[PDB]
Design an enzyme around this catalytic site. Structure first.
Site, PDB file in Angstrom:
ATOM      1  N   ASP A 267      92.236  34.718 113.302  1.00 24.52           N
ATOM      2  CA  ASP A 267      91.935  35.528 112.161  1.00 24.52           C
ATOM      3  C   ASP A 267      92.309  36.985 112.526  1.00 24.52           C
ATOM      4  OD1 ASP A 267      90.625  36.173 109.681  1.00 24.52           O
ATOM      5  OD2 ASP A 267      89.109  37.133 110.952  1.00 24.52           O
TER       6      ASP A 267
ATOM      7  N   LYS B 124      94.253  27.696 106.774  1.00 17.62           N
ATOM      8  CA  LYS B 124      94.093  27.936 108.209  1.00 17.62           C
ATOM      9  C   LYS B 124      93.983  26.625 108.940  1.00 17.62           C
ATOM     10  CE  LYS B 124      91.835  32.423 107.681  1.00 17.62           C
ATOM     11  NZ  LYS B 124      91.533  33.542 108.606  1.00 17.62           N
TER      12      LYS B 124
ATOM     13  N   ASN C 162      86.753   4.923 145.511  1.00 20.33           N
ATOM     14  CA  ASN C 162      86.505   3.687 144.773  1.00 20.33           C
ATOM     15  C   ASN C 162      87.611   2.651 144.944  1.00 20.33           C
ATOM     16  OD1 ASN C 162      84.031   4.009 142.503  1.00 20.33           O
ATOM     17  ND2 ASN C 162      84.865   5.940 143.293  1.00 20.33           N
TER      18      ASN C 162
ATOM     19  N   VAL D  38      80.428  -2.357 141.227  1.00 27.84           N
ATOM     20  CA  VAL D  38      79.853  -1.134 141.767  1.00 27.84           C
ATOM     21  C   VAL D  38      80.901  -0.314 142.518  1.00 27.84           C
ATOM     22  CG1 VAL D  38      78.376  -0.272 143.620  1.00 27.84           C
ATOM     23  CG2 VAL D  38      77.419  -1.771 141.839  1.00 27.84           C
TER      24      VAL D  38
ATOM     25  N   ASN E  86      79.170   6.722 146.774  1.00 27.84           N
ATOM     26  CA  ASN E  86      79.837   7.213 145.578  1.00 27.84           C
ATOM     27  C   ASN E  86      79.056   8.291 144.845  1.00 27.84           C
ATOM     28  OD1 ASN E  86      82.092   5.578 145.909  1.00 27.84           O
ATOM     29  ND2 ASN E  86      81.083   3.835 144.911  1.00 27.84           N
TER      30      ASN E  86
ATOM     31  N   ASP F 276      87.000  31.088 108.190  1.00 24.76           N
ATOM     32  CA  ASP F 276      87.613  30.563 109.402  1.00 24.76           C
ATOM     33  C   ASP F 276      86.956  29.264 109.846  1.00 24.76           C
ATOM     34  OD1 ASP F 276      89.300  32.761 109.909  1.00 24.76           O
ATOM     35  OD2 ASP F 276      87.562  33.882 110.697  1.00 24.76           O
TER      36      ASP F 276
ATOM     37  N   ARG G 262      88.529  50.790  85.549  1.00 27.62           N
ATOM     38  CA  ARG G 262      89.845  50.165  85.757  1.00 27.62           C
ATOM     39  C   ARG G 262      91.024  50.906  85.095  1.00 27.62           C
ATOM     40  NH1 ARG G 262      90.041  45.892  83.258  1.00 27.62           N
ATOM     41  NH2 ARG G 262      91.983  45.044  84.206  1.00 27.62           N
TER      42      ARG G 262
ATOM     43  N   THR H 222      95.499  35.123 108.111  1.00 28.55           N
ATOM     44  CA  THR H 222      94.589  36.078 107.497  1.00 28.55           C
ATOM     45  C   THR H 222      94.501  35.919 106.022  1.00 28.55           C
ATOM     46  OG1 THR H 222      94.130  38.460 107.142  1.00 28.55           O
ATOM     47  CG2 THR H 222      96.432  37.851 107.466  1.00 28.55           C
TER      48      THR H 222
ATOM     49  N   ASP I  64      94.016  38.395 104.271  1.00 24.77           N
ATOM     50  CA  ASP I  64      94.405  39.742 103.852  1.00 24.77           C
ATOM     51  C   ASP I  64      95.852  39.733 103.360  1.00 24.77           C
ATOM     52  OD1 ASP I  64      94.107  42.505 103.384  1.00 24.77           O
ATOM     53  OD2 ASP I  64      94.152  43.064 105.480  1.00 24.77           O
TER      54      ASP I  64
ATOM     55  N   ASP J 197      85.772  34.974 112.783  1.00 20.47           N
ATOM     56  CA  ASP J 197      84.445  35.529 112.636  1.00 20.47           C
ATOM     57  C   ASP J 197      83.905  35.193 111.266  1.00 20.47           C
ATOM     58  OD1 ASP J 197      86.313  37.066 111.232  1.00 20.47           O
ATOM     59  OD2 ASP J 197      84.924  38.719 111.084  1.00 20.47           O
TER      60      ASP J 197
ATOM     61  N   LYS K  63      88.202  61.475  93.362  1.00 23.18           N
ATOM     62  CA  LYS K  63      89.078  60.697  94.218  1.00 23.18           C
ATOM     63  C   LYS K  63      89.561  59.470  93.475  1.00 23.18           C
ATOM     64  CE  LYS K  63      85.901  57.524  96.239  1.00 23.18           C
ATOM     65  NZ  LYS K  63      84.664  57.526  96.991  1.00 23.18           N
TER      66      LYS K  63
HETATM   67  N1  LIG Z   1      85.129  53.477  93.679  1.00 21.43           N
HETATM   68  C1  LIG Z   1      86.404  53.951  93.667  1.00 21.43           C
HETATM   69  N2  LIG Z   1      86.614  55.292  93.445  1.00 21.43           N
HETATM   70  C2  LIG Z   1      87.908  55.711  93.408  1.00 21.43           C
HETATM   71  N3  LIG Z   1      89.050  55.020  93.576  1.00 21.43           N
HETATM   72  C3  LIG Z   1      88.800  53.700  93.798  1.00 21.43           C
HETATM   73  C4  LIG Z   1      87.519  53.082  93.854  1.00 21.43           C
HETATM   74  N4  LIG Z   1      87.642  51.688  94.106  1.00 21.43           N
HETATM   75  C5  LIG Z   1      88.971  51.476  94.179  1.00 21.43           C
HETATM   76  N5  LIG Z   1      89.730  52.679  93.996  1.00 21.43           N
HETATM   77  C6  LIG Z   1      91.162  52.977  93.977  1.00 21.43           C
HETATM   78  O1  LIG Z   1      91.734  52.417  92.822  1.00 21.43           O
HETATM   79  C7  LIG Z   1      92.501  51.279  93.132  1.00 21.43           C
HETATM   80  C8  LIG Z   1      91.912  50.166  92.224  1.00 21.43           C
HETATM   81  O2  LIG Z   1      91.802  48.926  92.875  1.00 21.43           O
HETATM   82  P1  LIG Z   1      92.203  47.532  92.205  1.00 21.43           P
HETATM   83  O3  LIG Z   1      91.238  46.755  91.414  1.00 21.43           O
HETATM   84  O4  LIG Z   1      93.478  48.037  91.435  1.00 21.43           O
HETATM   85  O5  LIG Z   1      92.856  46.720  93.356  1.00 21.43           O
HETATM   86  P2  LIG Z   1      93.993  46.401  94.398  1.00 21.43           P
HETATM   87  O6  LIG Z   1      95.230  47.064  93.671  1.00 21.43           O
HETATM   88  O7  LIG Z   1      93.670  47.053  95.685  1.00 21.43           O
HETATM   89  C9  LIG Z   1      94.027  44.707  94.337  1.00 21.43           C
HETATM   90  P3  LIG Z   1      95.090  43.567  94.879  1.00 21.43           P
HETATM   91  O8  LIG Z   1      95.260  43.548  96.451  1.00 21.43           O
HETATM   92  O9  LIG Z   1      94.462  42.118  94.723  1.00 21.43           O
HETATM   93  O10 LIG Z   1      96.349  43.557  94.100  1.00 21.43           O
HETATM   94  C10 LIG Z   1      92.276  51.012  94.651  1.00 21.43           C
HETATM   95  O11 LIG Z   1      93.414  50.474  95.261  1.00 21.43           O
HETATM   96  C11 LIG Z   1      91.878  52.404  95.224  1.00 21.43           C
HETATM   97  O12 LIG Z   1      92.925  53.274  95.516  1.00 21.43           O
HETATM   98 MG   LIG Z   2      87.489  37.641 109.634  1.00 20.02          MG
END
Ligand SMILES: Nc1ncnc2c1ncn2[C@@H]1O[C@H](COP(=O)(O)OP(=O)(O)CP(=O)(O)O)[C@@H](O)[C@H]1O
Ligand SMILES: [Mg+2]
Ligand SMILES: CC(=O)C1=C(O)N2[C@H](C1=O)[C@H]1c3c[nH]c4cccc(c34)C[C@H]1C2(C)C
Ligand SMILES: [K+]
Ligand SMILES: [Mn+2]
Ligand SMILES: [Mn+2]
Length: 994
Positions: free
Chosen positions: A351, A684, A768, A304, A796, A707, A489, A625, A627, A703, A515
């Site tokens: 991240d 990671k 103790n 104890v 204690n 991760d 594409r 990342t 990315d 997030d 665009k």
């Molecule tokens: N809905 C949309 N309308 C117009 N432009 C678009 C679009 N979605 C993507 N884009 C354009 O066209 C490009 C096509 O994207 P894609 O498939 O070539 O990929 P990425 O080059 O970004 C891929 P990674 O990082 O893996 O190499 C994009 O980078 C962007 O500029």
């Molecule tokens: Mg994230």
């Protein structure tokens, strides 16, 4: 089926020997279910509260206090017809403590919510297949999908298994793979081989991964793998590898458990050697019934005295209070110990996306054309502020706010941004924030239009829900969208065909707004817009514009850029076929280039300053990342992980480049580099593991689902309040307001907590120690135990209880965040400090046996003076003649033990003051510093007096109050403990190591 990404579609089909227009036969499905099992992740339990409490009563030390609970139970049952009244308070106060310490032990170590269950959120109940027995798609349980199944996925679907894409039915297949990359921007998939055997997920552009989802389009695939053999299954397995680790001190505890549980086993056979010392002269007057029972009585008292019960409670209390302080900064700690583990962190892995950054894609730069003077081409550049989807921020020219509507080219840019767009913005009334609806990169354009407000629309009085799309709506009132040439594409652009709204004034004629990726859009422009005028696009002009765009794409900038154009004279609606995307490029030719926008996912405002504070505290931050590396390094530069011109060749790695290193260099990379990009969820955890294999205490912040493994592996996992449920349930702490600064605050709290713990653990242990010294002095010598268990237990648990908790409330140091992290190995005592209170312990252990025996000989009342006879009370019943002039019962008086206890209580209360600081004498550090320590002792004191003066109390505790001469004797035999240690401080602040 392995390596589906490198196989062609024909090789995948031939592997399972199935046709894409038939699918598996139901018999094959049956055989594959046998062979591969169902398509699901195994659930992971976690012991019933049953097997948890059970495990509290397993670690050796705890048994020691159960032994002395059963032994105490027996040696309180066969109690003579005397006091069987309160003989059971001992085997119960003990048996009670062990109960309380378990219930608490579990209430802090148990993780309520399960992260594997949260993960199963990404498993759809249903999937769609083509099987040979029907022509039409079949909607079945996902768990019934098998390798070889032809599966169909479509917009809004959760992908049910790892799938090689066979055939894209829409014009594009856009997939959100954030659960494996952290990135929410859609991946555009295709069906060609990706030859690299080491392709990381971000490369497998022809695969669908179970648990991701389809942001758009329709496709057919063949299932390569199901169950745990999938990417999400690997995540599931790393979270299942449950190491249930423990705080550095919590391992110190677990350690000291082993420490103290032998020290007792040794001290018991040691009391037994001095108990067998006078075993050669028992004169067999009381057989051995008296001997084998006086020896257990001693064991229960030593056991104890050694175990510092109440320790579990002061700690839990310290922690819990810490948790309360952090909750007020918006740090939700989900595990009590963690609040403090963060303090010794030396490396914080993080991240990037949604952690270091807002995960809200933002147009931050744009330009139009100001003038074209033949070959020279002047651009008009603007920057835009704000870092969320909230339409808050301004457009700046040379860093000063301007009104976008001033510039015709901006009105047109906004118009294209608004119309050539399938997304929008929405104000979530429940979360109180703006959120995207659709693709991030499109919503960024939506947000931009709202910031630009090119028509100077009054928006200040709108509700936040109406404000979300106000300036975009105003543009819709001018041009009516008639149809979209969706993205393909081959051209990498999209366009919308528009007519001026009824009641023009706007401008007559239909328009196409375009665009896309700069290079393809610009190649299809024959003109350039300058204000409202239009001039021929020339080579030198095209080259200036492409050059600036390329700089924007690779800078310290590294922005995603879109080029914006409009076809001034579109074909007539009737001359265009909309059902064939292959024709769209041609329809988007003879364009007029208008401008460019550049977006990024930007750092949270506080991150930079937080990294610096971490650096100031000797903590490294490492970005990890999913990315790309370019973006990753660029964000690192913006947030001060790298210098703006630092060369990072060997400080930044993709997961692949990191994998390419010799295993030895991989370990060293982790100490040198601060950016790891294009990483998989495994990379990671691997980095965290390497870090930890230098014995660095490491944190992970994240997030995302990707991760979760690192979050589980780190000593401390930290999740963003606005991140995934999976990351939160994989963490020890959640930043509810996403404030990265709170981590810096949590470290400080943790260092403050660590300092107070270690010393209140000393204060409680110095205690103790004396007890043992006493329960051994009054044992070896053959003296009447100066203290017994039921009293020690009170001391204690309660007497020292309050004061210990008081110390956990001492003020943190001022340089607390200017020291480097303490080493994990650091003990809790070393050389000087150990023998420090082995001295304070040699004093208590003695001054207690010495004030109890004092009441015998050189004291007044005062049986008494027996000397060598006192160390021989076993033979007062037998050899009575010796003891003449005295009774044979006054050797069991409450007064002498009340003297002993009153000394301990007095020594420890004093020992609480010299505990306020480790070295600083009370001279230089006032005892009035921690007021709560004062109220703490005055309570302990006023409780001591109590159990001395309350009819019941003194019988259950065997005490009988002390005269004012019995207290002058206590003080004059206790207070000196101060001067003792007080001089141990003067001999350490100067001639030791100061
Ligand atoms: N809905 C949309 N309308 C117009 N432009 C678009 C679009 N979605 C993507 N884009 C354009 O066209 C490009 C096509 O994207 P894609 O498939 O070539 O990929 P990425 O080059 O970004 C891929 P990674 O990082 O893996 O190499 C994009 O980078 C962007 O500029
Ligand atoms: Mg994230
Ligand atoms: C029933 C139960 O769960 C427990 C307990 O019953 N206790 C603690 C404990 O956790 C014991 C313990 C293990 N390791 C250490 C280090 C330092 C102090 C303690 C411990 C107190 C121990 C005891 C017996 C009070
Ligand atoms: K963890
Ligand atoms: Mn325990
Ligand atoms: Mn691409």
């Amino acid at each position: 089926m392995e390596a589906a990404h490198s196989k062609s579609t024909e090789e995948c089909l031939a592997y399972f020997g199935v046709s894409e227009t038939t699918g598996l036969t139901p018999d094959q499905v049956k055989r594959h279910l046998e062979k591969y099992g169902h398509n699901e992740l195994p659930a992971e339990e976690g012991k019933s509260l049953w097997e948890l409490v059970i495990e509290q009563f397993e670690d050796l030390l705890v048994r020691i206090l159960l032994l002395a609970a059963c032994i105490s139970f027996v040696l309180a049952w066969f109690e003579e017809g005397e006091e069987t009244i309160t003989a059971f308070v001992e085997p119960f106060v003990i048996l009670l403590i062990l109960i309380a310490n378990a219930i608490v032990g579990v209430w802090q170590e148990r993780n309520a919510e399960n992260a594997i269950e949260a993960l199963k959120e990404y498993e759809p109940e249903m999937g769609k297949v083509y099987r040979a027995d029907r022509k039409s798609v079949q909607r079945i349980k996902a768990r019934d999908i098998v390798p070889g199944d032809i599966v169909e996925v479509a917009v809004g679907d959760k992908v049910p298994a790892d799938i090689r894409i066979l055939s894209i039915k829409s014009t594009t297949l856009r997939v959100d793979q954030s659960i494996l990359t952290g990135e929410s921007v859609s991946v555009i998939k295709h069906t060609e081989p990706v030859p690299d055997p080491r392709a990381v997920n971000q490369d497998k552009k022809n695969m669908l991964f179970s648990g991701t989802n389809i942001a758009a389009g329709k496709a057919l695939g063949i299932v390569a793998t199901t169950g745990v053999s999938t990417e999400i299954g690997k995540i599931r397995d790393q979270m299942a590898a449950t190491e249930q680790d423990k705080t550095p001190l919590q391992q110190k505890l677990d350690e000291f458990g082993e420490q103290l549980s032998k020290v007792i086993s040794l001290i018991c056979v040691a009391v037994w050697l001095i108990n067998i010392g006078h075993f050669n002269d028992p004169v067999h007057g009381g057989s051995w019934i008296r001997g084998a029972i006086y020896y257990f009585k001693i064991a229960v008292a030593l056991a104890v005295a050694a175990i510092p019960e109440g320790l579990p409670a002061v700690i839990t209390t310290c922690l819990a209070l810490g948790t309360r302080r952090m909750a007020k900064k918006n740090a939700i700690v989900r595990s009590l110990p963690s609040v403090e583990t963060l303090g010794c962190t030396s490396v914080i892995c993080s991240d990037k996306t949604g952690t270091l950054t807002t995960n809200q894609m933002s147009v931050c730069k744009m330009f139009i054309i100001d003038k074209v003077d033949g070959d020279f081409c002047s651009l008009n550049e603007f920057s835009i502020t704000g870092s969320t989807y909230a339409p808050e921020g301004e457009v700046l020219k040379n860093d000063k706010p301007i009104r976008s509507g001033q510039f015709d080219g901006l009105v047109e840019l906004a118009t294209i941004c608004a119309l050539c767009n399938d997304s929008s913005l929405d104000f979530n009334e429940t979360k109180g924030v703006y959120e995207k609806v659709g693709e991030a990169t499109e919503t960024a354009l939506t947000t931009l239009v709202e910031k630009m407000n090119v028509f100077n629309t009054e928006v200040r009085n709108l509700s936040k829900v109406e404000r979300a799309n106000a300036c975009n709506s105003v543009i819709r009132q001018l041009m009516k969208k008639e149809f979209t040439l969706e993205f393909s594409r081959d051209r990498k652009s999209m366009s919308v065909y528009c007519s001026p709204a009824k009641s023009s004034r706007a401008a007559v004629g239909n328009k196409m707004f375009v665009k896309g990726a700069p290079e393809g859009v610009i190649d299809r422009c024959n003109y350039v817009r300058v204000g409202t005028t239009r001039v021929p696009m020339t080579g030198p002009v095209k080259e200036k514009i492409l050059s600036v765009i390329k700089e924007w794409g690779t800078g310290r900038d590294t922005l995603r850029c879109l080029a914006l154009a409009t076809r001034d004279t579109p074909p007539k609606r009737e001359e265009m076929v909309l059902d064939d995307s292959s024709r769209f490029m041609e329809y988007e030719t003879d364009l007029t280039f208008v401008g460019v926008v550049g977006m990024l996912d930007p750092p949270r405002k506080e991150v930079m300053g937080s990294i610096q504070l971490c650096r100031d505290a000797g903590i490294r931050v490492i970005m990890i990342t999913g990315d790309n590396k370019g973006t990753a390094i660029a964000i690192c530069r913006r947030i001060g992980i790298f210098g703006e011109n630092e060369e990072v060749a060997d400080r930044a790695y993709t997961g692949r480049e990191f994998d390419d290193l010799p295993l030895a260099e991989q370990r060293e990379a982790c100490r040198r580099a601060c950016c790891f990009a294009r990483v998989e969820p495994s990379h990671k955890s691997k980095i965290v593991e390497y870090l930890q294999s230098y014995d660095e205490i490491t944190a992970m912040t994240g997030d995302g689902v990707n991760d979760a493994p690192a979050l589980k592996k780190a000593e401390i996992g930290i999740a963003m309040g606005s991140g995934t449920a999976v990351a939160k349930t994989a963490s020890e702490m959640v930043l509810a307001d996403d404030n990265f600064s709170t981590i810096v605050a949590a470290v400080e709290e943790g260092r403050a907590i660590y300092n107070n713990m270690k010393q209140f653990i000393r204060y409680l242990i110095s205690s103790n120690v004396g007890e043992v010294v006493c329960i051994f002095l009054t044992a070896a010598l053959g003296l009447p135990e100066a203290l017994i268990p039921v009293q020690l237990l009170w001391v204690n648990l309660v007497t020292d209880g309050l004061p210990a908790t008081a110390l956990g409330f001492n003020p943190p140091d001022l340089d607390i965040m200017d020291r480097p992290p303490r080493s994990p190995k650091e003990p809790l005592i070393s050389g000087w400090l150990f023998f420090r209170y082995m001295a304070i312990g040699g004093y208590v252990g003695a001054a207690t046996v010495g004030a109890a025996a004092w009441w015998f000989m050189y004291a007044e009342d005062g049986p008494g003076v027996t000397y060598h006879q006192l160390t021989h009370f076993m033979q007062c019943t037998e050899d009575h003649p010796h003891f003449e002039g005295l009774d044979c019962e006054i050797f069991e008086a409450p007064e002498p033990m009340t003297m002993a206890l009153s000394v301990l209580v007095t020594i420890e209360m004093c020992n609480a003051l010299n505990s306020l600081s480790e070295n600083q004498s009370l001279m230089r550090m006032p005892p009035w510093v921690n007021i709560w320590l004062l109220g703490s002792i005055c309570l302990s004191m006023s409780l001591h007096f109590l159990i001395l003066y309350v009819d019941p109390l003194p019988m259950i505790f065997k005490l009988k109050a002390l005269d004012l001469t019995q207290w002058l004797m206590v003080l004059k035999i206790s207070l000196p403990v101060i001067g003792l240690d007080e001089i141990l401080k003067f001999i350490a602040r100067n001639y030791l190591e100061g």
